[PDB]
Amino acid sequence: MREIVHIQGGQCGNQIGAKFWEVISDEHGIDPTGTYHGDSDLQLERINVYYNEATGGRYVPRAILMDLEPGTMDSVRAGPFGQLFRPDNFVFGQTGAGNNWAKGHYTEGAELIDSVLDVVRKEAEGCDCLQGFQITHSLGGGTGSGMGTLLISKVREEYPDRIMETFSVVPSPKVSDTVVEPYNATLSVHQLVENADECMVIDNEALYDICFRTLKLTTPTYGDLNHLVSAAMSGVTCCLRFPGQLNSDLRKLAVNLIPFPRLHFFMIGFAPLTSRGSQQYRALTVPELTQQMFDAKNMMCAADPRHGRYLTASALFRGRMSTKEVDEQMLNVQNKNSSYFVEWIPNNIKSSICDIPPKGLKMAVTFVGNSTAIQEMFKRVAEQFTAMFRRKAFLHWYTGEGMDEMEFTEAESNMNDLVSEYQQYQDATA
Template sequence: MKREVLTIQVGQCGNNIATSFWEGAIYEHNIKLDGMLVEPLTPIGNQNLYFQETLNGRYVPRSVLVDLEPTIIDQIKSTNIGSVFKLENIISRTYGAGNNWAKGYCTDGYDIIDSVMDTIRREAEQSDMTNIFQMVHSLGGGTGSGFGSLICEKLREEYQKSILLNQSVLPGFVLDCVVEAYNVGLTLPHLLGSSDQVFLIDNIALYEIYFKQLKIQTPTYLDLNKLITDHSLCFTSGWRFSSGVDEKKIVDLMQPFKLGSLSYINADNQIYNMTCQTELLPNQQRCLRVRFQREQRVKYKYYRILPTN
């Protein structure tokens, strides 16, 4: 069955992470920053899952960029990868939500939700079969939490038979803003009622990976986004490379909330056959094993797929 994924980037955190994901996906699918294939006669994987091919052979991300303030989106448009996105799929306002969940859900976000849904609807109608929606956002900020909750509800209401996946970033123990914990508490019930699968990204786990495993004491947000991108590319690799994966069966068998925490372990160019996802990948792909365990928690495993040289 043909699958197509529409990614919705919400808020500052969501747009930064999703843009980092697109940089990795462009590299893995052998696409240049202008959207053209490096070698047109030898495509790698299923580009049409996350990219839409235009009449001139250019691949454009199936993505909608949303934020209540324009700073981050303007920065993305000024970078090299900014030109690959559709300008009509970029929506922003003048002022942000100010870490206020209610402003994202009830007031400022509610004022533009019709415009956002019209853009999502138009993008879905231009595709052959958009049956998976992937939202990337944070749970601590006002836009990612409040407006993200509103978008989830609208998507579930309009696309009842589609799969809705959320990649949600949890704030750390030391909060940047005192209301972040309230934003998380207000968002989780909406995700539980609307989303099919929520992948929780633990900020504390990301920092500990850099402190303990990678021995980097001052990681930047770009470094943290790189780890999250590794997780995203890994999870979607079974779809992006011809594997016959049935996403609906995977979602039905998984718990509603999944904690994704990573740490790197050298693979020495070895192939690790530890999960079915690894076995479904092309033979020319090699795996880098990633693992994290904190205190007495359950161990979570993900596998980052790296192209061979």
């Protein structure tokens, strides 16, 4: 029943998916032993969306874990909720990537991708009516940004009809963690515009800013970080799992948010986010939600959404709300933000309703938008790439594995072209 299958590669996506599956298991009342102890019948009509049924009355997530080294995967199998996954969905290499895009995409990646392709295939014909694919990865590393995107290209090749979305952890110029992000970042983003139907971006720096300013938590770790991104993960697919007054599948979100085939990069946000003090002090209301979920400092990337104009926007309310308050809030915030929204298309905002609030919450809002403010991140990426490419720094370990400067040049040119065609809409007038 329009089920979706999860794949993740590299320790980044591994952590993201591991915590996302914990969130979904908590929501559906599934123990780490894989046995259901929920309260409702309503948790059981849509179990097939994410969980397959096995012998003994237990459920298994339909997720694939891929990596070029077994360390992080041995960590996740030992972590909590590690017993849900079948032992057969673990695939690992003995070499690793070493932040080398060529190693993860050409030499080790190509020879290892056969098994992961086979398992994802057999699982895909496993389901009755396949709905789509979701991928979680980071473009700033080697194994993820290479092997994941190679699998993206392959899967898009054999399934041109299905819908596919990816969640990209991109390098931030401020918070630097490796010396050579821009090269493989550009290499990956080049191969995304042609295949990925949906791509939505997350940034560690701005997500830190969220944790330290809104949550005001003194010493955050990666755990609550992944918790926020996983809440964003789960908030979008609520309608496909629960009844609601306005159902909306991923295809509807796509066709309703994207005007042109090459503008499929998205900015997301989650509400209500509050500090540990005022939980009992602030009233949860649709006006307060709609106010917070359009706060620019509520987004999870360093891009400032006040620096451009929104093309399309969408809000997916969860919980029992009246439709009008949503409608008038959307129209009023549209009217008093005319200068910050594109003019040539009227009513560029989606409102969708699902009547199941999250665990421990009464209402929630997930925002997804397409704006001309995302391209500033690609200006930083392009400037860094050009600066470190002019002197040919670190080029030669790439080119010693069958690479040459042709692909680097074409990727750089294509990304600049994307930036140009994305910015020319900012000042366009009808």
